[PDB]
Design a protein around this ligand. Structure first.
Ligand SMILES: [Cl-]
Ligand SMILES: [Cl-]
Ligand SMILES: [Cl-]
Ligand SMILES: [Cl-]
Ligand SMILES: [Cl-]
Ligand SMILES: [Cl-]
Ligand SMILES: [Cl-]
Ligand SMILES: [Cl-]
Ligand SMILES: [Cl-]
Ligand SMILES: [Cl-]
Ligand code: NA
Length: 129
């Protein structure tokens, strides 16, 4: 599913991301835009052989099982394919674990490089939330 911007904002909010670990909703929307273009089906290989899955590009090195990432872990206890669903629940639950792991949203390199310190509230402008 390719979410609309405000559609994704609403879903993330319903699932409790707005201000999770202190990160306002626009941070999450911004990260999803640059990670996935709001496409739940996005997958992208990493150099280390792991793969990133879903709207927030959660990797298989630590967080989900894809059966092909040797040496990796599955800390979200889910198949990576669960991160590709129309329903974003599994992605949000797993993101909550990631952002709690000590480095906050810096876990998402694209958030650090493209969202951090910017006017992230712009990502939720106009949305009826
Ligand atoms: Cl915001
Ligand atoms: Cl881009
Ligand atoms: Cl894909
Ligand atoms: Cl992989
Ligand atoms: Cl994801
Ligand atoms: Cl393969
Ligand atoms: Cl594996
Ligand atoms: Cl392994
Ligand atoms: Cl999803
Ligand atoms: Cl933080
Ligand atoms: Na894994």
């Amino acid at each position: 599913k390719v979410f609309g911007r405000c559609e994704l904002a609403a879903a993330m909010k319903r699932h409790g991301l707005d201000n999770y670990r202190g990160y306002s909703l626009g941070n999450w929307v911004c990260a999803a835009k640059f990670e996935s273009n709001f496409n739940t089906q996005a997958t992208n290989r990493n150099t280390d052989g792991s793969t990133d899955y879903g709207i927030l590009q959660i990797n298989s090195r630590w967080w989900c099982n894809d059966g092909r990432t040797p040496g990796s872990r599955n800390l979200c206890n889910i198949p990576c394919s669960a991160l590709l669903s129309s329903d974003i629940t599994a992605s949000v639950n797993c993101a909550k674990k990631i952002v709690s792991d000590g480095n906050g949203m810096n876990a998402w390199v694209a958030w650090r490089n493209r969202c951090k310190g910017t006017d992230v509230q712009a990502w939720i402008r106009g949305c009826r939330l």
